[PDB]
């Protein structure tokens, strides 16, 4: 009997990754969740069944004039097998323009929401939020939830960076020398990476862990995402996009967070006790309702024998379901998957 999980930032914000979570090393009794040394977080599925996830990117940093943009969220339902390992990056909010008392004088600096040394405000853009990522097989991010752009200040210039992206992005015509110099390439970025070139180096405002865009001027850094926000766009165009690999969830819901916060992943257990062959599944708006039904999602009322395989497989092929979407399909003995038409066969 386990409560819903809330995979969070462990008190970390801004550029610096999490350092201390509940568990930092794996246990064997309730192996559960723990923090890796690269800033990602592992979780071992404890019970085979349907899970409802909410995956939210981090919001943009804020300046004395304006609040950052909220991260992007995706809510999905996915069937998970016990002992499967999920690796995740929880995006963190972008930092803010400040000054620090270095030596006996005040230099421009970047300040996170958990900064102990923030007393003086700066008059420039703030940085973008990091995206929030989930990988099943640790070869690509099956889920990317976009982060929000940072707060812009009053003016305009081209001294601003894109957040990180999963896939290629053709940048905006206004992304020139500086923008290309400071734009992030991957979500996992190191300290010296993408400071503003030259004199504006100290004035760099760092996007949050998860690839939040830096800023070097008045514009807020764009949010990271499947494709990063456009620093030159209007409204949500500045914030990152989200995508879910269709090999992971059939019907994900994408929406904008109602709050300016760090990233996080909510994992909900399906708790309704269900009479076989029906299992617990979610269906209302945003999967907020648990119900008993055929795991493939079909009505039990189709025929006298509930949850019967709805496909007739051909020749050298057996009866299967897809490990995550529970989509009915036909495994061909030569490797080939006929999760396809009446037409298709085993070559
Ligand atoms: C920072 O922006 C500079 C200002 O120019 C921009 O104009 C357009 C393109 C738009 O992006 C705008 O917002 C920018 O302000 C960039 O410099 C300029 O770069 C272009 C190439 O992108 C230069 O191109 C000329 O060169 C010869 C002249 O005869 C032509 O062949 C070119 O025509 C085009 O040819 C093809 C037609 O199908 C196709 O490749 C493009 O449509 C070409 O435009 C073109 O007239 C242009 O002269 C130049 N303008 C000025 C005022 O300097 C600047 O740098 C550039 O950076 C990259 C993209 C490289 O191509 C550089 O060699 C080039 O100098 C850009 N910097 C950065 C880092 O982004
Ligand atoms: C999520 O991913 C899929 C593929 O990774 C995207 O689909 C493509 O969309 C373009 C048109 O917009 C098609 O012409 C391509 O052929 C599609 N590719 C594939 C492989 O199907 C989808 O649009 C992505 N969603 C977002 C919001 O980025
Ligand atoms: C998905 O469903 C299949 C059902 O056959 C599971 O398959 C097995 O996977 C492991 C590989 O780690 C091996 O024991 C065999 O390759 C498979 N077993 C048999 C009896 O064929 C698979 O484990 C399920 N889950 C995942 C996450 O892939
Ligand atoms: C097909 O979908 C549902 C079957 O799961 C039908 O509705 C429900 O059936 C049970 C699972 C039970 O939880 C009911 O309270 C629930 O409403 C649904 O009515 C049917 N669709 C149509 C169009 O008839």
UniProtKB/Swiss-Prot annotation:
Positions annotated with a glycan in the UniProt record: 83, 176, 243, 299, 323, 343
Included range, full protein: 551 to 897 of 1421
Location(s), subcellular: Cell membrane
Family, per entry: Belongs to the protein kinase superfamily. Tyr protein kinase family. Insulin receptor subfamily.
Domain of life: Eukaryota
Gene that produces this protein: scd-2
Protein's job: Probable tyrosine-protein kinase receptor which regulates the dauer/non-dauer developmental decision probably by controlling daf-3 transcriptional activity in parallel or together with the TGF-beta pathway. Regulates integration of conflicting sensory cues in AIA interneurons. May act as a receptor for hen-1. In AWA neurons, together with hen-1, plays a role in regulating olfactory adaptation by controlling the forgetting sensory responses to odorants such as diacetyl.
Tissue: Expressed in AIA sensory neurons.
Subunit structure: Interacts (via cytoplasmic domain) with fsn-1 (via SPRY domain).
Protein name per the record: ALK tyrosine kinase receptor homolog scd-2
